[PDB]
């Protein structure tokens, strides 16, 4: 009775999910939607059981009564003795990244520049930087701050979508799924790399995983970390090796959500599925790897080591943290 229906966002996640379904012996099956918000609705209607969400989308799903189930956990440091599945998660660093050759651009001179965002409503790509900006400017007019941007999920004819590129046919401009060339951590960092935008709002890991030979994808195979700088909130610029003293925020790890009535069955199936297909799973790399997708972060981030159990059966508010929830709430007063 634990057949779990996963929700895939867009056609590339659907194909990966179908491969997972086949390998799992239909213990997992797939439903697909065009946007994360649409996948959330399938879950609320009981037509899907679950999916993995960024923290800004956990806020949306949690105000509708979905609950967190397990969290992505990446490479640690402290607490190294514990199993991954039992390790406390530590959040990721939200950063603002520019080209080093774009000299004299700082946090304080971002007005009228071009921006690259993972998607509207995501933590590092949107909630953190636009929340800071609205606050700093004393103005809700966040869609008139940058001259042009790519922020998937915005109005396709607005300046907030002017920089997005759509799929290789040129269709689906500014849609919030992987078919949009500049969607997600990797799409927004590509948007900066090709110099479509002046600044990209991503996380620290994205910079490292797509530079210095860590990616062999054509747009990234030849990028060097030294060609990039982080923008710090005190007006200074630093090397990407200094993210710990030059970030915008610490963000809560992406996590799986489901209906409260399905949480327990979803949790058990996932724990067993990752034993088979997770990082050292017994059929990965042989048959299927749940946490790989050629750096495209499909279903899970490709840097995921395991999905970890949560401490204290937290509410979505306790998971996200009171201060982040309040920042989101404040930013949403604007629109």
């Amino acid at each position: 009775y634990t057949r779990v229906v996963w929700c895939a966002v867009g056609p590339e996640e659907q194909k990966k999910c179908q491969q997972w379904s086949q390998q799992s012996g239909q213990n997992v099956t797939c439903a697909t939607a065009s946007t994360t918000d649409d996948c959330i609705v399938l879950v609320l209607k009981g037509e899907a059981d679950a999916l993995n969400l960024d923290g800004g989308y956990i806020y949306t799903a949690g105000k509708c009564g979905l609950v967190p189930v397990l969290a992505e956990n990446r490479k640690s440091s402290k607490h190294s003795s514990l199993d991954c599945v039992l390790r406390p998660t530590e959040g990721y660093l939200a950063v603002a990244v520019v080209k080093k050759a774009n000299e004299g651009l700082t946090w304080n001179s971002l007005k009228d520049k071009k921006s690259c965002h993972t998607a509207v409503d995501r933590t590092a790509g949107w909630n953190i930087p636009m929340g800071l900006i609205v606050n700093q400017t004393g103005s809700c007019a966040f869609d008139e701050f940058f001259s042009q941007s790519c922020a998937p999920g915005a109005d396709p004819k607005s300046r907030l979508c002017a920089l997005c590129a759509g799929d290789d046919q040129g269709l689906d401009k500014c849609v919030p799924n992987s078919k949009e060339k500049y969607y997600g951590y990797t799409g927004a960092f590509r948007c900066l790399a090709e110099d479509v935008g002046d600044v990209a709002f991503v996380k620290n890991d994205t910079v490292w995983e797509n530079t210095n030979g860590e990616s062999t994808a054509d747009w990234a195979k030849n990028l060097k970390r030294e060609d990039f700088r982080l923008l710090c909130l005190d007006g200074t610029r630093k090397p990407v090796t200094e993210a710990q003293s030059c970030h915008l925020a610490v963000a809560p790890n992406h996590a799986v959500v489901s209906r409260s009535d399905r949480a327990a069955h979803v949790e058990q199936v996932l724990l067993h599925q990752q034993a088979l297909f997770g990082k050292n799973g017994k059929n990965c790399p042989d048959k299927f790897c749940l946490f790989k997708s050629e750096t495209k972060n499909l279903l899970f981030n490709d840097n995921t080591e395991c999905l970890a159990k949560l401490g204290g059966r937290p509410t979505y508010e306790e998971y996200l943290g009171t201060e982040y929830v309040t920042a989101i709430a404040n930013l949403k007063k604007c629109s």
Binding site: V41, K63, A329
Partner: peptide, 6 residues
């Protein structure tokens, strides 16, 4: 300050 957007 609270309501499901759907």
């Amino acid at each position: 300050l609270e309501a499901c957007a759907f």
